[PDB]
Write an enzyme that holds these catalytic residues in place. Structure first.
Site, PDB file in Angstrom:
ATOM      1  N   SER A 156       0.817  -1.203   0.000  1.00  0.00           N
ATOM      2  CA  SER A 156       0.000   0.000   0.000  1.00  0.00           C
ATOM      3  C   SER A 156       0.858   1.264   0.000  1.00  0.00           C
ATOM      4  CB  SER A 156      -0.996   0.007   1.174  1.00  0.00           C
ATOM      5  OG  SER A 156      -1.847  -1.128   1.071  1.00  0.00           O
TER       6      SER A 156
HETATM    7  C1  LIG Z   1      -1.491  -2.195   1.790  1.00  0.00           C
HETATM    8  O1  LIG Z   1      -0.409  -2.354   2.341  1.00  0.00           O
HETATM    9  C2  LIG Z   1      -2.415  -3.383   1.651  1.00  0.00           C
HETATM   10  C3  LIG Z   1      -3.570  -3.332   2.654  1.00  0.00           C
HETATM   11  N1  LIG Z   1      -3.049  -3.456   4.010  1.00  0.00           N
HETATM   12  C4  LIG Z   1      -2.720  -2.234   4.712  1.00  0.00           C
HETATM   13  O2  LIG Z   1      -3.088  -0.973   4.194  1.00  0.00           O
HETATM   14  N2  LIG Z   1      -1.999  -2.254   5.966  1.00  0.00           N
HETATM   15  S1  LIG Z   1      -1.970  -0.763   6.454  1.00  0.00           S
HETATM   16  O3  LIG Z   1      -2.357   0.167   5.389  1.00  0.00           O
HETATM   17  O4  LIG Z   1      -0.657  -0.450   7.032  1.00  0.00           O
HETATM   18  N3  LIG Z   1      -3.220  -0.651   7.515  1.00  0.00           N
HETATM   19  N4  LIG Z   1      -4.512  -1.080   7.216  1.00  0.00           N
HETATM   20  C5  LIG Z   1      -5.211  -0.802   8.350  1.00  0.00           C
HETATM   21  C6  LIG Z   1      -6.670  -1.101   8.457  1.00  0.00           C
HETATM   22  C7  LIG Z   1      -7.124  -2.413   8.531  1.00  0.00           C
HETATM   23  C8  LIG Z   1      -8.491  -2.652   8.618  1.00  0.00           C
HETATM   24  O5  LIG Z   1      -8.979  -3.921   8.700  1.00  0.00           O
HETATM   25  C9  LIG Z   1      -9.368  -1.583   8.620  1.00  0.00           C
HETATM   26  O6  LIG Z   1     -10.710  -1.805   8.705  1.00  0.00           O
HETATM   27  C10 LIG Z   1      -8.873  -0.287   8.536  1.00  0.00           C
HETATM   28  N5  LIG Z   1      -7.553  -0.076   8.454  1.00  0.00           N
HETATM   29  N6  LIG Z   1      -4.406  -0.244   9.284  1.00  0.00           N
HETATM   30  C11 LIG Z   1      -4.749   0.208  10.634  1.00  0.00           C
HETATM   31  C12 LIG Z   1      -4.778   1.732  10.607  1.00  0.00           C
HETATM   32  O7  LIG Z   1      -6.006   2.153   9.999  1.00  0.00           O
HETATM   33  C13 LIG Z   1      -4.652   2.308  12.015  1.00  0.00           C
HETATM   34  O8  LIG Z   1      -4.463   3.728  11.957  1.00  0.00           O
HETATM   35  C14 LIG Z   1      -3.194  -0.165   8.739  1.00  0.00           C
HETATM   36  O9  LIG Z   1      -2.147   0.309   9.305  1.00  0.00           O
HETATM   37  N7  LIG Z   1      -1.673  -4.634   1.810  1.00  0.00           N
HETATM   38  C15 LIG Z   1      -2.074  -5.745   1.200  1.00  0.00           C
HETATM   39  O10 LIG Z   1      -3.066  -5.826   0.489  1.00  0.00           O
HETATM   40  C16 LIG Z   1      -1.226  -6.908   1.428  1.00  0.00           C
HETATM   41  N8  LIG Z   1      -1.523  -7.728   2.330  1.00  0.00           N
HETATM   42  O11 LIG Z   1      -2.639  -7.457   3.035  1.00  0.00           O
HETATM   43  C17 LIG Z   1      -2.915  -8.210   4.209  1.00  0.00           C
HETATM   44  C18 LIG Z   1      -4.206  -7.673   4.819  1.00  0.00           C
HETATM   45  C19 LIG Z   1      -1.720  -8.066   5.142  1.00  0.00           C
HETATM   46  C20 LIG Z   1      -3.076  -9.658   3.819  1.00  0.00           C
HETATM   47  O12 LIG Z   1      -3.480  -9.928   2.666  1.00  0.00           O
HETATM   48  O13 LIG Z   1      -2.787 -10.534   4.663  1.00  0.00           O
HETATM   49  C21 LIG Z   1      -0.032  -7.107   0.587  1.00  0.00           C
HETATM   50  C22 LIG Z   1       0.355  -6.189  -0.381  1.00  0.00           C
HETATM   51  S2  LIG Z   1       1.789  -6.689  -1.219  1.00  0.00           S
HETATM   52  C23 LIG Z   1       1.766  -8.097  -0.210  1.00  0.00           C
HETATM   53  N9  LIG Z   1       2.719  -9.052  -0.329  1.00  0.00           N
HETATM   54  N10 LIG Z   1       0.767  -8.194   0.675  1.00  0.00           N
END
Ligand SMILES: *C(=O)[C@H](CNC(=O)NS(=O)(=O)n1nc(-c2cc(O)c(O)cn2)n(C[C@@H](O)CO)c1=O)NC(=O)/C(=N\OC(C)(C)C(=O)[O-])c1csc(N)n1
Length: 501
Positions: free
Chosen positions: A242
């Protein structure tokens, strides 16, 4: 042999303000002429003792080398320890004055500075990268010996040694200490495996801090665990996920087709692309504006924008800000990662590029790309050395688009529902969290401050946090907040967000 080499004084490495980081220190090496020792066997046990060697194993060594005129006894003693053994007056024992590096900041800047080997040659980090500059050139002294190899005298200095040259790094040791402490703290608070933190001057391309965990004390050559010796900021590649969405957004705003108040419908939080499904981290949204896509970190939202503007535009911005590209630094072992290209971009690959999946970068690249965004869209080449005249750099994103994206990233930090843990006491800041599934995760935050007239960019990577919270906005954001708050103050940036009125 009719000469002995005269080791050259290796150049001082300092931080950007002259703080010593690697200093050549006098040591003494002892050597012996076995042909002389063989005439003085009654002295061997006292000599063995002085050298911390077993009596009989030492005698065995001399006897086995009896035909030789030179063997080393021990290297790198203090001058006083060396003089102590010379003062025993054992025939055939001699000393040579040499140098050994000392690293006054030890583990705090071990990965940047690197280390030398027993011969004083650079073998890791800056020591290796700038070895030619730092090393200077040995001299030669002609000696007179008798037919048994007894050294009678120095006949003359044939070639004088030329000292190596001083080198001032870009690193600010004050910021390096703060980053080191705070990265270590966050590692421990989260039970994580490893991490890196990079701070860059957005105006000058200077790397002001570059710290990793685990680390090692380069002054201590024992144990040595090669995994602690990894300069992860430059060598570990990772999917930035992200944290690249602001570059996708830059492409969108540059295309003429998108403005920040535009709306994308992301319901129901998944989007099927043939056999592949894009899935949002949170799935409680329908319409989001473009800043909302960043706040919510919606893969679906950024993908739909990507389909509209095309992947070529996004690949171009990412390539131009240096993701997956050679940094042009000298640096031993540095990896380049990979920014995939296509002759024709299919739909799935267009989406995944846009949200940073299946491409790989280093923390240094990611910080450099943020620095370009922060510097009103102008990229300045990276430097690990102090920059006195700033190079011209390259305008990679339009200043207007850079400005707009800066403002959106400030909202990501400051707005309701945003990454509030990244807020910096006293200052406006801007940035973007990420979380990458490697379940095992890497937690990311990248950003810059102050949000207006940015001065520094920073990337925090925390590898495999092991508590129930693992998102970048939870794990890495607070490290950005604390390190940015200290770094800006150390740099005398006046606070632009103290309480008002
Ligand atoms: C981007 O990195 C993308 C989505 N994951 C994130 O954006 N993590 S974060 O932006 O650092 N982040 N998201 C949240 C969050 C989580 C929620 O469930 C809700 O409802 C709201 N926000 N937070 C908490 C903050 O809002 C607190 O202020 C975050 O810090 N990444 C991916 O898509 C990838 N993996 O995703 C996960 C979910 C880890 C997965 O699939 O297991 C990804 C991208 S490239 C890769 N190898 N994996």
């Amino acid at each position: 042999v009719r000469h002995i080499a005269i080791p050259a004084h290796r150049g001082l490495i300092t931080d950007r303000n002259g703080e010593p980081l690697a200093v050549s220190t006098p040591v003494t090496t002892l050597w012996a002429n076995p042909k002389e020792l063989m005439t003085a066997k009654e002295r061997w046990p006292q000599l063995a003792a002085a050298l911390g060697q077993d009596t009989k194993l030492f005698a065995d060594r001399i006897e086995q080398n009896a035909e030789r005129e030179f063997i080393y006894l021990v290297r790198g003693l203090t001058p006083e320890q060396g003089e102590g053994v010379i003062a025993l007056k054992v025939p055939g024992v001699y000393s040579i004055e040499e140098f050994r590096r000392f690293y006054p900041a030890g583990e705090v800047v071990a990965h940047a500075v690197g280390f030398t080997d027993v011969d004083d040659r650079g073998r890791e980090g800056i020591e290796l990268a700038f070895d030619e500059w730092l090393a200077g050139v040995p001299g030669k002294r002609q000696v007179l010996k008798d037919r048994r190899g007894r050294v009678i005298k120095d006949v003359q200095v044939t070639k004088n040694a030329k000292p190596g040259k001083t080198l001032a790094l870009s690193i600010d040791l004050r910021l390096q200490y703060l980053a080191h402490r705070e990265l270590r703290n966050a590692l421990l608070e989260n039970g994580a495996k490893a991490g890196s933190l990079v701070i860059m001057d957005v105006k000058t391309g200077e790397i002001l801090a570059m710290t990793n965990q685990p680390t090692y004390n380069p002054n201590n050559r024992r144990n040595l665990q090669p995994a602690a010796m990894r300069n992860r900021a430059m060598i570990d590649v990772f999917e930035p996920g992200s944290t690249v969405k602001p570059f996708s957004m830059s492409a969108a705003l540059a295309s003429g087709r998108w403005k920040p108040s535009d709306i994308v419908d992301v319901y129901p939080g998944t989007l099927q692309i043939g056999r592949y499904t894009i899935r949002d981290v949170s799935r409680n949204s329908r319409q989001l504006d473009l800043t909302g896509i960043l706040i919510k970190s919606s893969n679906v939202g950024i993908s739909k924008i990507a389909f509209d503007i095309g992947a070529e535009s996004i690949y171009s911005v990412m390539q131009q800000v240096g993701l997956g590209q050679d940094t042009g630094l000298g640096f031993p072992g540095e990896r380049v990662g990979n920014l995939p290209n296509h002759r024709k971009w299919p739909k799935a690959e267009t989406a995944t590029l846009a949200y940073g999946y299946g491409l790989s970068v280093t923390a240094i690249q990611l910080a450099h790309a943020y620095a370009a965004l922060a510097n009103d869209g102008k990229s300045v080449p990276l430097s690990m050395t102090r920059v006195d005249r700033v190079p011209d750099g390259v305008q990679v994103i339009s200043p207007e688009v850079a400005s707009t994206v800066q403002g959106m990233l400030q909202q990501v930090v400051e707005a309701q529902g945003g990454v509030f843990r990244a807020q910096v006491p006293g200052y406006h800041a801007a940035g973007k969290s990420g979380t990458a599934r490697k379940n095992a995760y890497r937690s990311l935050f990248a950003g810059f401050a102050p949000a207006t007239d940015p001065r520094i960019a920073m990337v925090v990577v925390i590898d495999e946090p092991s508590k129930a919270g693992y998102f970048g906005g939870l794990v890495s954001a607070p490290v950005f907040s604390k390190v940015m708050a200290g770094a800006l103050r150390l740099m005398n940036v006046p606070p632009d967000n103290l309480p008002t009125a």
